[PDB]
Amino acid sequence: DMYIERAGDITWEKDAEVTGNSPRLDVALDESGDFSLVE
Amino acid sequence: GETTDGVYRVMTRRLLGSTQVGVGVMQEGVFHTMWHVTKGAALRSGEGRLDPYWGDVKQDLVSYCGPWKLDAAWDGLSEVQLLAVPPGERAKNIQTLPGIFKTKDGDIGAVALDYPAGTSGSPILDKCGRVIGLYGNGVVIKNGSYVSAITQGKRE
Numbered sequence: 001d002m003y004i005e006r007a008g009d010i011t012w013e014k015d016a017e018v019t020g021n022s023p024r025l026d027v028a029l030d031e032s033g034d035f036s037l038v039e
Numbered sequence: 040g041e042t043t044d045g046v047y048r049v050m051t052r053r054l055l056g057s058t059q060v061g062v063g064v065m066q067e068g069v070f071h072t073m074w075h076v077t078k079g080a081a082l083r084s085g086e087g088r089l090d091p092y093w094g095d096v097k098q099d100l101v102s103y104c105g106p107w108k109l110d111a112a113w114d115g116l117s118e119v120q121l122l123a124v125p126p127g128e129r130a131k132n133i134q135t136l137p138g139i140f141k142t143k144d145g146d147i148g149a150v151a152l153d154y155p156a157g158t159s160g161s162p163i164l165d166k167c168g169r170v171i172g173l174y175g176n177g178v179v180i181k182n183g184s185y186v187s188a189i190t191q192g193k194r195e
């Protein structure tokens with residue numbers, strides 16, 4: 001049995017830590033909802 | 040139960056202790072999460088119950104108490120924030136410029152940020168604070184890195 005617990009408000013944070021890159025990837029999506037890389 | 044808008048953890052006591060299996064968004068009386076987090080099972084919120092209303096394994100999304108309400112979209116140019124809610128850790132906003140998933144049916148925004156699997160369902164927001172999708176369905180790229188799609192549902 002599952003339950004929910006509030007974690008916070010949904011707001012934009014000014015001066016938040018900025019990270020991550022922006023890859024452009026060729027992908028396929030199957031009937032099970034699984035993404036895969038196309039090569 | 041508590042139906043105030045906000046980000047919530049999705050917990051289970053089936054396994055050892057209380058384990059965080061994912062995250063979700065409460066908006067306009069509807070709870071929104073990823074299908075793989077709950078498998079569409081009913082949820083408890085205090086003494087109240089939340090029943091599934093809509094779900095789709097291929098989109099990997101589910102809504103409780105009502106139809107999917109989130110309809111904001113990434114503009115394809117601007118930086119976004121993952122409001123990451125990791126297991127046992129405080130909610131934290133991380134800013135990033137999304138990449139692109141190129142598919143035969145169109146292009147989808149993607150965020151290249153690495154969090155535990157129990158962070159699935161954390162909302163990705165635009166500069167106005169609107170939820171443009173949920174984090175947690177994507178792919179593992181060559182360097183073992185994780186790249187999640189920005190998964191958004193349709194608002195009827």
Ligand SMILES: NCCc1cccc(NC(=O)c2cc(Cl)cc(NC(=O)OCc3ccccc3)c2)c1
Binds near residue numbers: 176
């Ligand atoms: N494909 C249908 C949906 C589905 C089903 C079942 C699960 C998912 N999602 C994920 O597995 C998922 C989600 C998130 Cl938020 C992150 C990660 N990846 C990550 O960051 O992993 C870190 C790592 C560290 C040590 C060892 C191995 C991995 C995966 C989707």
